[PDB]
């Protein structure tokens, strides 16, 4: 009941108040306790993917929202970890919205921290939802996120060794399958590290 | 009360660039109470103003 009414008002103010960056004054004006913060982030992502198309206002509301307090960005890290557990459970059309919001917050990189480690599943084990969505978020996030500085700066950020599928050298299927999937997805020279390491 | 003597807007591109500065000092966000009791702090329309009662 509390999450149903909280989602009814959160969705009512979500569909209203154009330029949601200003609507954050109302969202924070609701004064929801810490118990409603995690449910407000999960239901906030549900309303973000509930639209008929990818909306940048959801990415801005998540960037400023999660960027407000410590438990906010923490709720974005844990909520992103719970979002990584969706995979095939997520909708096909909503996967592009999750890749647009996750690519928008990933372009800023502020709130997400270990999200780069939670991604990159194994070589032959995938639901194709995280592979296709990883290709959409990798292409769009590569275009708008400064891919040369994102891959070059990400190589020294220790995000690749923290990710399972991004690990070069030892594992032949991770580096080789990462070179075939990356080069096949349009990464180009970004897979040269796993290609030479493999 | 009202806008009083001010009609709508009066300004100039050269006057604003001379009076103000794109790069200037920033300390406090222009406290209105500071300019209230200090008619020299706010130079906009100082006409027919009874003010400046110092302390107590």
């Amino acid at each position: 009941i509390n999450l149903v009414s909280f989602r009814r008002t959160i969705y009512l103010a979500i569909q209203s108040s154009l330029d949601f960056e200003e609507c954050a004054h109302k969202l924070l004006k609701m004064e929801f306790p810490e118990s409603q913060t995690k449910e407000l982030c999960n239901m906030i992502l549900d309303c973000c993917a509930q639209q008929r198309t990818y909306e940048k206002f959801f990415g801005l509301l998540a960037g400023r929202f999660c960027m407000l307090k410590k438990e906010y960005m923490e709720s974005f890290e844990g909520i992103f970890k719970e979002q990584y557990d969706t995979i095939h459970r997520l909708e096909t059309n909503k996967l592009r919205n999750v890749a647009k919001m996750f690519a928008h917050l990933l372009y800023t990189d502020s709130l997400p921290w270990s999200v780069l480690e939670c991604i990159k599943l194994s070589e032959e084990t995938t639901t194709s939802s995280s592979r296709i969505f990883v290709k959409i978020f990798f292409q769009e996030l590569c275009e708008y996120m400064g891919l040369p500085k994102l891959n070059a700066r990400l190589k020294d950020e220790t995000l690749q060794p923290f990710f399972e599928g991004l690990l070069p050298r030892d594992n032949p299927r991770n580096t080789r399958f990462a070179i075939n999937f990356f080069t096949s997805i349009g990464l180009g020279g970004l897979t040269d590290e796993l290609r030479e390491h493999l | 009360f009202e806008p009083l003597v001010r009609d709508i807007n009066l300004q100039d591109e050269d006057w604003n660039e001379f009076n103000d500065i794109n790069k200037i000092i920033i300390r406090q966000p222009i406290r209105t109470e500071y300019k209230i009791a200090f008619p020299y702090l706010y130079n906009n329309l100082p006409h027919h103003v009874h003010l400046t009662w110092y302390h107590t």
Partner: peptide
């Protein structure tokens, strides 16, 4: 007309929207 914001005529449009600072302006300032 408050500091930095105000409407000369409060009766001019609708009602005076008691604005504050927005829970997001502090996020952008920090």
């Amino acid at each position: 007309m408050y500091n930095g914001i105000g409407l000369p005529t409060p009766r001019g449009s609708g009602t005076n929207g008691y604005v504050q600072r927005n829970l997001s302006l502090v996020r952008g300032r920090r």
